[PDB]
Amino acid sequence: LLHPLLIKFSKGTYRVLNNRNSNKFEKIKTIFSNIQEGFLVKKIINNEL
Amino acid sequence: NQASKGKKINIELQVTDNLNKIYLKSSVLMRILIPILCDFNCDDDINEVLVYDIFKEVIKSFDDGKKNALNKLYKIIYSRVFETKYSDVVIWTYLKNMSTDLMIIVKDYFKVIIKKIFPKLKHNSSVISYLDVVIKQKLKYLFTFKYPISYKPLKAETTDDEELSEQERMEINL
Amino acid sequence: INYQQSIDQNGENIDLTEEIGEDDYIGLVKFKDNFDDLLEKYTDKKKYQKEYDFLIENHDKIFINKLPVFSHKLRPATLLTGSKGKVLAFDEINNYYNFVIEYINQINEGVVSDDSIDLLLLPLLYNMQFYANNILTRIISEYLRGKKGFLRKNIMGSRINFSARNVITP
Amino acid sequence: SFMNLRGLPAKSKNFKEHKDLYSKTPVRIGNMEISNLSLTNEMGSIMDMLNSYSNNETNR
DNA sequence: CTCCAATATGTGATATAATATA
DNA sequence: ATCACATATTGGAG
DNA sequence: TCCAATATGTGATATAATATAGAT
DNA sequence: ATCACATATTGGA
């Protein structure tokens, strides 16, 4: 059930690792920018897990 | 040129002191040409085209028509934009819906830098720092702007699920 | 068809064509201008004589300046309204179409007669060609092929009015 | 029943919303069904069936 | 029961930056 | 963090 | 020097009813 | 992911 959150985290951290010549703090903020309360529930339902 | 020796040098990206001075000369000429172009009561679209072409021409005239400065400027903007492709692939995938591509951003940024940034260049100042800052900030602005309409690209693929989104969306309410 | 050029610190073109053929990286406009001689250069009769003959017979259809786009009723587009924000549901094909348009506009707003930097114009043409190729490929792979495709679903078969479904009993 | 955006018959959610008593769901004539129907060499009658029931609006 | 003029209010378009490197 | 243009609302008279 | 084998990569393609829903 | 089909190298002969 928690796998979509892991996928989202992995996308964010791949972004930050591959970031070049930009503010690291900014990308670290983008990691947790669109994390929303209903994200896990919506992803659980829609992915038909 | 003295400061460029320490850092890793890429021949296409490096900006000589002479090129910085060429850009400054073009900046002075652009500033003195702006009021004349603004007073022209012709249509604004043809006026923007004329401003772009005229500023390109002042840079070329200071460049002896070599067009090397414009090539290096395009290369700078191209590098700054394409560096974010691998890292920020998600926002580029989303921006595909808005008909915005990396090369499109490069061309638009080229027009903006020649028209709305080069005139603002300060005397005896480094062009590369100002350009880096403005391009990176414009990329941040682009990735972080709230567009009026959220976009849902219907994936017409059935690799895993039995029915794709376009299929059901067609049959239900249309 | 793709255009690529490198520059020196001073800005002179420095590629020198050391490892690339003279015909490569010329551009799509140079390709159209030099299409006949290049065709004679690279065609192998033994394996592609029939294809080369087909190209000769249809030389007019090889290069086109206008791209068709099919009806919007086939391209589903819904303007749904949401609380946090409005939403637009479209099939991916639309994107590609729109992309093409944008490109041509940015190519046409600049005066074609005035000489401009090739790096600003030729890669745009190459990307336009890539997008058009993807449009054709997606039309075949989505709208016109398979069980989902209009060919198998509705050209041979069809949903039939005046139909019923019943259980059987002795 | 309700016609699709392409002018061809298609299912509706009316039975789910209890707006209709029976399903009113269209049957599909499969490719194998077309092959079996081709036993009768009157392809004109089969085409008339498919056109009047689905493909052509004027014939319907 | 229209028509006038003007006011305050809404909406789209634009604008901000000055430590460089496949 | 403005600003030029579009719009519903008040003021006013006929 | 060549070549056939191995390996990589490309490409078509897939049942049957069915619960929905990315700064000021 | 199974089947086909096509190249690219490479160890082998």
Side-chain angles (χ1 to χ4, degrees):
Chain A
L1 288 176
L2 296 169
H3 201 259
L5 187 61
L6 175 61
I7 301 179
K8 191 57 190 175
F9 281 166
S10 73
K11 288 179 173 181
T13 199
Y14 282 154
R15 172 187 324 165
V16 178
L17 292 187
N18 303 339
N19 176 49
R20 300 160 65 180
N21 306 346
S22 191
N23 180 28
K24 189 177 294 186
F25 200 62
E26 159 213 2
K27 293 309 173 185
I28 296 180
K29 290 188 306 177
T30 74
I31 305 174
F32 323 108
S33 190
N34 224 30
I35 170 166
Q36 282 157 348
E37 295 174 329
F39 167 84
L40 203 54
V41 159
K42 272 136 43 192
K43 289 289 258 199
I44 281 173
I45 301 181
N46 298 12
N47 293 40
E48 301 298 330
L49 308 176
Chain B
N1 305 347
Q2 266 79 359
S4 74
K5 306 168 183 176
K7 188 59 184 58
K8 181 232 297 188
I9 306 175
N10 186 2
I11 50 179
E12 310 186 7
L13 272 172
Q14 193 195 352
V15 182
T16 80
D17 201 24
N18 184 25
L19 259 301
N20 194 87
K21 293 191 293 182
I22 292 179
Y23 290 136
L24 281 167
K25 297 165 192 182
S26 302
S27 306
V28 185
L29 192 46
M30 286 167 176
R31 291 192 219 91
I32 78 174
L33 278 172
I34 282 177
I36 315 171
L37 305 167
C38 290
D39 188 62
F40 207 16
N41 53 356
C42 264
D43 280 330
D44 301 358
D45 186 41
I46 79 164
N47 193 21
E48 286 202 4
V49 178
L50 278 179
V51 161
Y52 178 61
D53 288 9
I54 280 295
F55 284 11
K56 281 177 72 171
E57 198 70 20
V58 316
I59 310 173
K60 289 169 55 178
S61 306
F62 283 112
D63 204 20
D64 305 349
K66 298 172 194 171
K67 290 207 303 181
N68 298 357
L70 292 88
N71 300 6
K72 199 147 72 166
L73 187 63
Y74 168 86
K75 286 304 185 180
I76 294 170
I77 308 177
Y78 180 92
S79 298
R80 302 297 185 267
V81 175
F82 266 62
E83 277 180 355
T84 73
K85 171 181 50 182
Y86 270 83
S87 63
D88 305 338
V89 50
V90 187
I91 197 64
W92 288 120
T93 303
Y94 201 87
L95 282 181
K96 275 216 301 290
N97 307 322
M98 311 208 45
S99 301
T100 39
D101 196 30
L102 294 108
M103 299 194 330
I104 290 175
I105 291 309
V106 174
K107 181 175 185 296
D108 290 343
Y109 279 18
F110 193 80
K111 299 190 61 181
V112 172
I113 294 303
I114 294 191
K115 290 165 50 182
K116 301 171 183 176
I117 282 289
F118 264 8
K120 290 170 57 181
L121 186 55
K122 231 173 174 297
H123 274 261
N124 50 80
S125 298
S126 185
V127 196
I128 186 73
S129 63
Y130 195 43
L131 287 191
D132 191 292
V133 172
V134 298
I135 298 170
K136 287 299 167 51
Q137 278 298 141
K138 264 198 176 305
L139 289 177
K140 163 197 288 185
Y141 288 158
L142 180 69
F143 303 161
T144 60
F145 177 67
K146 189 164 63 178
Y147 305 102
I149 315 293
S150 286
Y151 293 106
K152 183 73 177 191
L154 295 176
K155 50 145 190 175
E157 301 276 320
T158 181
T159 55
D160 190 17
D161 294 329
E162 284 77 34
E163 310 150 337
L164 58 93
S165 46
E166 177 177 352
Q167 198 96 3
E168 61 91 32
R169 191 65 203 166
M170 200 166 306
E171 42 98 357
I172 55 176
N173 279 337
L174 288 178
Chain C
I1 54 186
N2 192 23
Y3 178 75
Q4 183 177 358
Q5 84 170 349
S6 59
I7 52 160
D8 191 28
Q9 322 175 352
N10 310 333
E12 187 180 352
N13 300 353
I14 206 181
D15 207 6
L16 289 179
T17 69
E18 303 183 3
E19 73 286 335
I20 53 172
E22 296 174 340
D23 307 325
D24 304 351
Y25 284 118
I26 54 176
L28 181 55
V29 49
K30 294 205 190 65
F31 174 84
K32 188 181 67 176
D33 294 347
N34 304 346
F35 176 55
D36 305 339
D37 40 285
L38 280 176
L39 192 59
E40 309 300 328
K41 293 188 191 71
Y42 292 93
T43 42
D44 181 21
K45 47 183 58 184
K46 305 183 182 303
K47 315 174 187 299
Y48 313 108
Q49 177 70 28
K50 307 303 171 181
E51 289 91 322
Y52 165 64
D53 299 337
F54 192 53
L55 294 176
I56 297 188
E57 301 171 44
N58 287 344
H59 60 97
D60 174 57
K61 287 89 179 63
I62 300 182
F63 287 105
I64 199 64
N65 46 15
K66 287 176 284 291
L67 183 73
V69 60
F70 54 103
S71 187
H72 73 148
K73 281 172 285 181
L74 302 177
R75 296 174 283 106
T78 62
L79 193 49
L80 306 174
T81 55
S83 55
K84 306 287 295 183
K86 308 171 51 189
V87 285
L88 186 61
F90 44 92
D91 180 47
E92 302 161 347
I93 193 69
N94 296 281
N95 287 330
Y96 290 93
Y97 278 126
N98 284 329
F99 255 129
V100 168
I101 311 169
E102 179 66 47
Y103 273 100
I104 83 173
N105 294 348
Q106 294 190 177
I107 295 167
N108 287 348
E109 64 94 33
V111 178
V112 289
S113 296
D114 295 12
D115 299 352
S116 298
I117 177 165
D118 282 350
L119 279 170
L120 210 65
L121 262 65
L122 296 196
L124 263 63
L125 263 81
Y126 165 74
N127 256 37
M128 194 170 49
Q129 177 81 59
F130 162 86
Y131 280 125
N133 289 349
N134 279 25
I135 292 173
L136 173 98
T137 300
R138 288 205 175 269
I139 297 174
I140 301 184
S141 73
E142 297 175 8
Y143 284 87
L144 277 187
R145 181 181 56 89
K147 189 179 186 179
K148 314 279 191 162
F150 199 67
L151 292 196
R152 284 190 48 171
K153 182 192 298 179
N154 273 312
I155 288 295
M156 190 178 310
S158 74
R159 300 293 165 174
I160 186 172
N161 273 359
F162 299 88
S163 64
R165 297 175 69 174
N166 269 202
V167 197
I168 44 172
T169 44
Chain D
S1 191
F2 295 98
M3 312 297 292
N4 209 3
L5 198 56
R6 302 181 174 183
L8 302 175
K11 192 191 175 183
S12 71
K13 305 172 62 177
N14 288 45
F15 188 68
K16 301 292 185 177
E17 299 157 340
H18 289 82
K19 294 178 167 54
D20 274 342
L21 201 173
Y22 39 80
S23 204
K24 295 203 177 65
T25 295
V27 162
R28 184 176 182 265
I29 310 299
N31 305 336
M32 294 187 316
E33 300 195 18
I34 292 295
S35 302
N36 207 317
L37 268 175
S38 293
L39 274 170
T40 61
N41 276 327
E42 316 282 346
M43 262 282 186
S45 66
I46 301 175
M47 280 309 297
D48 273 339
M49 169 182 62
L50 287 195
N51 288 353
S52 62
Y53 293 157
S54 165
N55 301 5
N56 200 355
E57 181 184 3
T58 305
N59 296 357
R60 194 179 323 109

Coordinates of all heavy atoms in Angstrom, one line a residue, chain C residues 91-135:
Chain C
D91 N -6.6 13.3 -25.7 CA -5.7 12.2 -26.1 C -4.3 12.9 -26.4 O -4.2 14.0 -26.9 CB -6.2 11.4 -27.2 CG -5.3 10.3 -27.7 OD1 -4.8 9.6 -26.8 OD2 -5.1 10.2 -28.9
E92 N -3.2 12.1 -26.2 CA -1.9 12.6 -26.4 C -1.7 13.2 -27.8 O -0.9 14.1 -28.0 CB -0.9 11.5 -26.1 CG -0.9 10.9 -24.7 CD -0.3 9.6 -24.6 OE1 0.1 9.0 -25.7 OE2 0.0 9.1 -23.5
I93 N -2.3 12.6 -28.8 CA -2.2 13.0 -30.2 C -2.3 14.5 -30.3 O -1.5 15.2 -31.0 CB -3.1 12.3 -31.1 CG1 -2.7 12.4 -32.6 CG2 -4.6 12.6 -30.9 CD1 -1.5 11.7 -33.0
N94 N -3.3 15.1 -29.6 CA -3.5 16.5 -29.7 C -2.3 17.3 -29.4 O -1.9 18.2 -30.1 CB -4.7 16.9 -28.7 CG -6.0 16.3 -29.1 OD1 -6.7 16.8 -30.0 ND2 -6.4 15.2 -28.4
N95 N -1.6 17.0 -28.3 CA -0.4 17.6 -27.9 C 0.6 17.7 -29.1 O 1.0 18.8 -29.5 CB 0.3 16.8 -26.8 CG -0.4 17.0 -25.4 OD1 -0.9 18.0 -25.1 ND2 -0.3 15.9 -24.6
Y96 N 0.8 16.6 -29.7 CA 1.8 16.6 -30.8 C 1.3 17.6 -31.9 O 2.1 18.4 -32.3 CB 1.8 15.2 -31.4 CG 2.5 14.2 -30.5 CD1 1.8 13.4 -29.6 CD2 3.9 14.0 -30.5 CE1 2.4 12.5 -28.8 CE2 4.6 13.1 -29.7 CZ 3.8 12.4 -28.8 OH 4.5 11.5 -28.0
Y97 N 0.1 17.5 -32.3 CA -0.5 18.5 -33.2 C -0.1 19.9 -32.8 O 0.6 20.7 -33.5 CB -2.0 18.3 -33.4 CG -2.4 17.2 -34.4 CD1 -3.2 16.2 -34.0 CD2 -1.9 17.2 -35.7 CE1 -3.6 15.2 -34.8 CE2 -2.2 16.2 -36.5 CZ -3.1 15.2 -36.1 OH -3.4 14.2 -37.0
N98 N -0.6 20.3 -31.6 CA -0.3 21.6 -31.1 C 1.2 21.9 -31.2 O 1.5 23.0 -31.6 CB -0.8 21.7 -29.6 CG -2.3 21.8 -29.5 OD1 -2.9 22.4 -30.4 ND2 -2.9 21.3 -28.4
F99 N 2.0 21.0 -30.8 CA 3.5 21.2 -30.8 C 3.9 21.7 -32.2 O 4.4 22.8 -32.3 CB 4.2 19.9 -30.5 CG 4.8 19.9 -29.1 CD1 4.6 18.9 -28.3 CD2 5.6 21.0 -28.7 CE1 5.2 18.9 -27.0 CE2 6.2 21.0 -27.4 CZ 6.0 19.9 -26.6
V100 N 3.5 21.0 -33.2 CA 3.8 21.4 -34.6 C 3.5 22.8 -34.8 O 4.3 23.7 -35.2 CB 3.1 20.5 -35.6 CG1 3.2 21.0 -37.0 CG2 3.7 19.1 -35.6
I101 N 2.2 23.2 -34.6 CA 1.7 24.6 -34.8 C 2.7 25.6 -34.1 O 3.2 26.4 -34.8 CB 0.3 24.7 -34.3 CG1 -0.6 23.6 -34.8 CG2 -0.2 26.1 -34.7 CD1 -1.9 23.5 -34.2
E102 N 2.9 25.4 -32.8 CA 3.8 26.3 -32.1 C 5.1 26.5 -32.9 O 5.5 27.7 -33.2 CB 4.1 25.8 -30.7 CG 5.0 26.7 -29.9 CD 4.4 28.1 -29.6 OE1 3.2 28.1 -29.2 OE2 5.0 29.1 -29.8
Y103 N 5.8 25.4 -33.2 CA 7.0 25.5 -33.9 C 6.9 26.4 -35.2 O 7.7 27.3 -35.3 CB 7.5 24.1 -34.3 CG 8.4 23.5 -33.2 CD1 7.8 22.5 -32.3 CD2 9.7 23.8 -33.0 CE1 8.5 21.9 -31.3 CE2 10.4 23.2 -32.0 CZ 9.8 22.3 -31.2 OH 10.6 21.7 -30.2
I104 N 6.0 26.1 -36.1 CA 5.9 26.8 -37.3 C 5.7 28.3 -37.1 O 6.3 29.1 -37.7 CB 4.8 26.2 -38.2 CG1 3.4 26.8 -37.9 CG2 4.7 24.7 -38.2 CD1 2.3 26.4 -38.8
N105 N 4.9 28.6 -36.0 CA 4.7 30.0 -35.7 C 6.0 30.7 -35.4 O 6.4 31.7 -36.0 CB 3.7 30.1 -34.5 CG 2.3 29.7 -34.9 OD1 2.0 29.4 -36.1 ND2 1.5 29.5 -33.9
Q106 N 6.8 30.1 -34.5 CA 8.1 30.6 -34.1 C 9.1 30.6 -35.3 O 10.1 31.4 -35.3 CB 8.7 29.9 -32.9 CG 7.9 30.0 -31.7 CD 8.7 29.4 -30.5 OE1 8.2 29.5 -29.3 NE2 9.8 28.9 -30.7
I107 N 8.8 29.8 -36.3 CA 9.6 29.9 -37.5 C 9.2 30.9 -38.5 O 10.0 31.5 -39.2 CB 9.7 28.5 -38.2 CG1 10.4 27.5 -37.3 CG2 10.4 28.5 -39.5 CD1 10.2 26.0 -37.7
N108 N 7.9 31.2 -38.5 CA 7.3 32.2 -39.5 C 7.3 33.6 -39.0 O 7.3 34.5 -39.8 CB 5.9 31.8 -39.8 CG 5.8 30.5 -40.7 OD1 6.9 30.1 -41.2 ND2 4.7 29.9 -40.9
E109 N 7.3 33.8 -37.7 CA 7.4 35.2 -37.1 C 8.7 35.9 -37.5 O 8.7 37.1 -37.7 CB 7.1 35.2 -35.6 CG 8.2 34.5 -34.8 CD 9.3 35.4 -34.3 OE1 9.0 36.6 -34.0 OE2 10.4 35.0 -34.2
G110 N 9.8 35.1 -37.6 CA 11.0 35.6 -38.1 C 11.0 35.7 -39.6 O 10.6 34.7 -40.3
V111 N 11.5 36.8 -40.2 CA 11.5 36.9 -41.6 C 12.4 35.9 -42.3 O 13.6 35.8 -41.9 CB 11.9 38.4 -42.0 CG1 12.0 38.5 -43.5 CG2 11.0 39.4 -41.4
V112 N 11.8 35.1 -43.2 CA 12.6 34.0 -43.8 C 13.7 34.5 -44.7 O 14.7 33.9 -44.9 CB 11.6 33.0 -44.5 CG1 10.8 32.2 -43.5 CG2 10.7 33.8 -45.5
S113 N 13.4 35.7 -45.3 CA 14.4 36.3 -46.3 C 15.7 36.7 -45.5 O 16.8 36.5 -46.0 CB 13.8 37.4 -47.0 OG 12.7 37.0 -47.9
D114 N 15.5 37.3 -44.3 CA 16.7 37.8 -43.6 C 17.4 36.6 -43.1 O 16.9 35.6 -42.5 CB 16.2 38.6 -42.4 CG 15.5 39.9 -42.8 OD1 15.2 40.0 -44.0 OD2 15.3 40.8 -42.0
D115 N 18.8 36.6 -43.2 CA 19.6 35.5 -42.8 C 19.6 35.5 -41.3 O 19.9 36.5 -40.6 CB 21.0 35.7 -43.3 CG 21.1 35.7 -44.8 OD1 20.1 35.4 -45.5 OD2 22.2 36.0 -45.4
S116 N 19.4 34.3 -40.7 CA 19.4 34.1 -39.3 C 20.3 32.9 -39.0 O 20.7 32.1 -39.8 CB 18.0 33.8 -38.7 OG 17.1 34.9 -39.0
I117 N 20.7 32.8 -37.7 CA 21.6 31.7 -37.2 C 20.9 30.4 -37.5 O 19.7 30.2 -37.2 CB 21.9 31.9 -35.7 CG1 22.7 30.8 -35.2 CG2 20.6 32.1 -34.9 CD1 23.4 31.0 -33.9
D118 N 21.7 29.5 -38.1 CA 21.1 28.2 -38.4 C 20.8 27.4 -37.2 O 19.8 26.6 -37.2 CB 22.2 27.4 -39.2 CG 22.2 27.8 -40.7 OD1 21.3 28.6 -41.1 OD2 23.1 27.4 -41.4
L119 N 21.5 27.5 -36.1 CA 21.3 26.8 -34.8 C 19.9 27.1 -34.3 O 19.3 26.3 -33.5 CB 22.3 27.2 -33.8 CG 23.7 26.4 -33.9 CD1 24.7 27.0 -33.0 CD2 23.5 24.9 -33.6
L120 N 19.3 28.3 -34.6 CA 18.0 28.7 -34.1 C 16.9 28.2 -35.0 O 15.7 28.1 -34.5 CB 17.9 30.2 -34.1 CG 17.0 30.9 -33.0 CD1 17.5 30.6 -31.6 CD2 16.9 32.4 -33.3
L121 N 17.1 27.8 -36.2 CA 16.1 27.4 -37.2 C 16.1 25.9 -37.6 O 15.0 25.3 -37.6 CB 16.2 28.3 -38.4 CG 15.2 29.5 -38.5 CD1 15.6 30.5 -37.4 CD2 15.3 30.2 -39.8
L122 N 17.2 25.4 -37.9 CA 17.3 24.0 -38.5 C 16.9 23.0 -37.4 O 16.1 22.1 -37.8 CB 18.6 23.8 -39.1 CG 19.0 24.6 -40.3 CD1 20.2 24.0 -41.0 CD2 17.8 24.8 -41.2
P123 N 17.4 23.0 -36.2 CA 16.9 22.0 -35.2 C 15.4 22.1 -35.0 O 14.8 21.0 -34.7 CB 17.7 22.3 -34.0 CG 19.0 22.9 -34.5 CD 18.5 23.7 -35.7
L124 N 14.8 23.2 -35.1 CA 13.4 23.4 -35.0 C 12.7 22.5 -36.1 O 11.7 21.9 -35.9 CB 12.9 24.8 -35.1 CG 12.7 25.5 -33.8 CD1 14.0 25.6 -32.9 CD2 12.1 26.9 -34.0
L125 N 13.2 22.6 -37.4 CA 12.7 21.8 -38.5 C 12.8 20.3 -38.2 O 11.9 19.5 -38.5 CB 13.3 22.2 -39.8 CG 12.6 23.2 -40.7 CD1 12.8 24.6 -40.2 CD2 13.0 23.1 -42.1
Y126 N 14.0 19.9 -37.7 CA 14.2 18.5 -37.4 C 13.2 18.0 -36.3 O 12.7 16.9 -36.4 CB 15.7 18.3 -36.9 CG 15.9 17.0 -36.3 CD1 16.0 15.8 -37.0 CD2 16.1 16.9 -34.9 CE1 16.2 14.6 -36.4 CE2 16.4 15.7 -34.3 CZ 16.4 14.5 -35.1 OH 16.6 13.3 -34.5
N127 N 13.0 18.8 -35.3 CA 12.1 18.5 -34.2 C 10.6 18.4 -34.7 O 9.8 17.6 -34.3 CB 12.2 19.4 -33.0 CG 12.9 18.9 -31.9 OD1 13.9 18.1 -32.0 ND2 12.5 19.2 -30.7
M128 N 10.3 19.3 -35.7 CA 9.0 19.3 -36.3 C 8.8 18.0 -37.1 O 7.7 17.3 -37.0 CB 8.8 20.5 -37.3 CG 7.4 20.7 -37.7 SD 7.3 22.3 -38.6 CE 8.7 22.2 -39.7
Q129 N 9.9 17.5 -37.8 CA 9.8 16.3 -38.5 C 9.6 15.1 -37.5 O 8.8 14.2 -37.8 CB 11.0 16.1 -39.3 CG 11.1 14.7 -40.1 CD 10.3 14.7 -41.3 OE1 10.5 15.5 -42.2 NE2 9.3 13.8 -41.4
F130 N 10.3 15.1 -36.4 CA 10.2 14.1 -35.4 C 8.7 14.0 -34.9 O 8.1 13.0 -34.7 CB 11.2 14.3 -34.3 CG 10.8 13.5 -33.0 CD1 11.2 12.2 -32.8 CD2 10.1 14.2 -32.0 CE1 10.9 11.5 -31.7 CE2 9.8 13.5 -30.8 CZ 10.2 12.2 -30.7
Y131 N 8.2 15.2 -34.6 CA 6.8 15.2 -34.1 C 5.8 14.7 -35.1 O 4.8 14.0 -34.8 CB 6.4 16.7 -33.6 CG 7.0 17.0 -32.3 CD1 7.8 18.2 -32.1 CD2 6.7 16.3 -31.1 CE1 8.2 18.5 -30.8 CE2 7.1 16.6 -29.9 CZ 7.9 17.7 -29.7 OH 8.4 18.0 -28.5
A132 N 6.0 15.1 -36.4 CA 5.1 14.6 -37.4 C 5.2 13.1 -37.6 O 4.2 12.4 -37.7 CB 5.4 15.3 -38.7
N133 N 6.4 12.5 -37.5 CA 6.6 11.1 -37.5 C 5.9 10.4 -36.4 O 5.2 9.4 -36.6 CB 8.1 10.7 -37.5 CG 8.8 11.1 -38.8 OD1 8.2 11.4 -39.8 ND2 10.1 11.0 -38.7
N134 N 6.0 11.0 -35.2 CA 5.3 10.5 -34.0 C 3.7 10.6 -34.2 O 3.0 9.7 -33.8 CB 5.7 11.2 -32.8 CG 7.0 10.6 -32.2 OD1 7.8 10.1 -33.0 ND2 7.2 10.8 -30.9
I135 N 3.3 11.7 -34.8 CA 1.8 11.8 -35.1 C 1.3 10.6 -36.0 O 0.3 9.9 -35.6 CB 1.5 13.1 -35.7 CG1 1.7 14.3 -34.8 CG2 0.1 13.1 -36.3 CD1 1.6 15.6 -35.4

